[PDB]
């Protein structure tokens, strides 16, 4: 088919999604040269699991997914199999044995404005942890007490979404990092994504 | 759904919502402190009022959880903090009024200026104008004019402010069930609910006074020895039994006798341990200074300063244009933003202070991982001590030869050790009576033992009695000479410098065992000692999660502060001063003063 993959559409996007409502795009009917991604060398974190990148290039799949979102720098450590923390519990959970790749780069110059960028949210509370690749955007008020909340914040009643604060002056750990998680799938259906 | 589980959730919700609002307050306060304009005060006022209203909101929620039901003390201590009411107790007018009072003093100190009598168009700031006079001038009248005009033209402005400041600060403290504002400040050292490690706020005074009595004999001989050399420096102006005149002490208030080294050096023929000349001769700038301090901490395994440190810190006087708080401040703004504000000059003084306030920063960085409310030193004394651990190693001649500020031929001998010990003593010993006396004056003013009527009377009584320093000019009650010092005027507890001075030798003692340096403690220079740094680090990462009595034992093996390490440091100088003073008076009479009646 010889259509180069729209990687430029996801990695170079003007805007990314908040992590609590991460965004996934299916890559179909395309030829993916995966080496050109690692050879951009812009990235701070580029780890693959359940597959070798060298071998990954000469390999076919029925479909490829790219999940994009943004979190704090020191929280990127949670985008890895079998991890615990605020993000992997209530925002984006990878399975413990995982085939795919995790890519992240510092997004300070792009997603932090003077005075603060608050459009980026993250889920802070939830009744139970997320199953892998589960996604939750409920806005119901978390109840921590025997007393009901009546749908408003209050005592032992906390709105479950919190806002990221990104200023240019923040330490590296508090700076905004952009994350892309590459899922591969193999169905009983014709492969639509290959390398050269 | 147990009470302990709800509180953990409530603290977590707090820790996440709190971080940004504090960061905003820090960020606005940075703008004012770096650049005093009326606008930046308004913006700073708004950020702090927003943060204060958040705490009052959370405090109301926090006060609904029964405190005694919390088991783990680490959690219990955070919950306890959030119930404090703080300044919310003050009525809205009284709250705004005190904020206005504090800002007015804050500005007066950093921007007040006294003009020359012969020429009224040349006016001088405290820094760098007056500090320089008090630090290098050898003329009595010049030092006298700088000393007296600052007190009379600026201190008298602070008097009616401090009067109402005491009243409101007292209102707020006594409403939080402390006996006075002095009690509130002492509560920083308080430890409760931990068998064998508790520390009562009253215990702090007992310890400070008890430790002080062992320092008196060392100080008296240092005092007697300095007065002897001074009697040659200022011929007819010094009594051989009298107190020392305050303006002859080396800086604006006589807090550090450091600049008296030039007049009081024991062996002038030996090469200079005051590297100020070498720094100037080698064309050092402030960049070089802080890089040599950064390089130091790295030598023991501590991290480089963040990129945001070198980018955002103010390390030189911004100029005539921008008006800034030139006092050395070390800033943990939260969210990983670390900064230092300091109007650096090329002096050994600033070189050592760079190591000091950078040690402050390393501590801030080490406990960054803690939950929000535990991000803080174990107590005020710990925080103000880490930097002086380094200042102790950096100042040693061995370290100075190591970095090239002493000639590579210079080798230590006994006269050299005495020279070094004497300078260290002028800085470290000299400040102890000064520091203790000041804090006692405040504690008595706050408690109410000194009436509004006799503030300056009792202040100078204690200066002659304790510090052995006399005022050159009689000051009535229109003055407020305590307020003329940065800490008094900018609302900072001062006892933190007394306890840090005892702490630093306890820590040094334990670190020179870790580097297994053999010899006298005054030649230590822990450097290239990963083993030493890691021992110090393991205590810094704790922040305030453990009681300082415990954390202090974990390093030095002592539940409480001790002066034995401090006196063991200066022991060789102690015997030396005793021999120098055999034909000189030691002590002083309170009665002689350098003026009539
Ligand atoms: C903590 O750890 C650091 C790192 O190890 C130490 O810094 C090192 O210090 C040593 C000495 O201060 C440096 O070693 C070399 O020292 C030479 C001194 O010359 C010698 O003196 C006589 C002869 O004159 C001899 O006994 C013996 O050879 C001495 O070494 C310097 O002159 C050298 O500098 C030269 O470097 C280059 C390299 O060829 C030349 O081109 C130059 O022209 C110059 O002459 C040499 O540097 C060592 O380099 C330092 N290391 C680093 C990384 O800087 C600290 O001293 C230590 N601190 C403490 C407190 O222990
Ligand atoms: C030390 O601190 C001082 C603080 O006083 C700093 O001095 C200030 O420097 C900043 C530099 O950013 C200046 O701010 C700028 O002001 C510009 C003025 O623009 C006028 O015209 C506009 C027409 O479009 C108008 O919008 C504007 O403001 C009005 O509308 C605003 C809402 O739109 C409203 O909020 C305002 O209140 C006002 O009603 C003005 O009429 C502006 O265009 C810039 O965007 C910028 O904001 C300040 O003027 C300086 N303050 C002074 C001179 O007093 C100083 O820089 C600091 N030092 C250092 C080293 O940084
Ligand atoms: C996101 O955007 C950047 C650019 O903003 C992409 O990087 C660009 O990659 C192309 C690859 O074709 C580079 O073009 C090359 O230029 C040389 C010039 O001599 C030419 O000889 C080559 O044949 C090739 O065409 C381009 O220079 C490079 N730009 C930058 C600034 O590095 C990046 O690939 C995009 N991301 C994705 C996933 O597509
Ligand atoms: C902090 O201030 C609040 C002000 O509300 C105090 O709460 C009050 O406590 C007294 C005595 O316990 C009651 O009479 C009031 O009814 C309480 N407030 C309300 C809203 O009813 C609180 O006591 C103060 N903090 C401490 C430690 O006492
Ligand atoms: C701390 O910062 C200094 C100064 O930037 C670093 O020293 C540089 O190290 C790089 C490679 O490690 C060299 O290429 C440079 O020549 C060094 N000097 C400079 C840039 O002036 C040092 O490595 C840093 N240390 C740590 C632990 O991060
Ligand atoms: C330093 O004092 C020692 C103490 O024993 C003494 O013996 C010696 O004279 C001195 N060392 C010198 C002068 O190098
Ligand atoms: Zn300090």
Residue numbers in the entry:
A (entry chain B): 332 to 527
B (entry chain A): 19 to 615
What's the paper's own text on this?
Angiotensin-converting enzyme 2 (ACE2) is lineage B clade 1 specific receptor including SARS-CoV-23. The receptor binding domain (RBD) of S1 subunit directly binds ACE2, therefore, it is the most important targeting site to inhibit viral infection. The protease domain (PD) of ACE2 is known to harbor the interface to viral spike protein, located in the top-middle part of ACE2 ectodomain. Similar to anti-receptor binding domain (RBD) antibodies, extracellular domain of ACE2, soluble ACE2 (sACE2), can also be used to neutralize SARS-CoV-2 as a decoy receptor.
In contrast, mutation sites K31N and E35K are located at the center of the binding interface. As for L79F and A25V, both mutations are conservative in nature but accompany acquisition of larger sidechains. In WT ACE2, L79 forms a small hydrophobic pocket with Y83 and M82 that accommodates F486 of RBD, which has been suggested to be a key determinant of SARS-CoV-2 that gives higher affinity than SARS-CoV-1 (right). In addition, A25V mutation fills a space at the back of the pocket together with L97 (left).
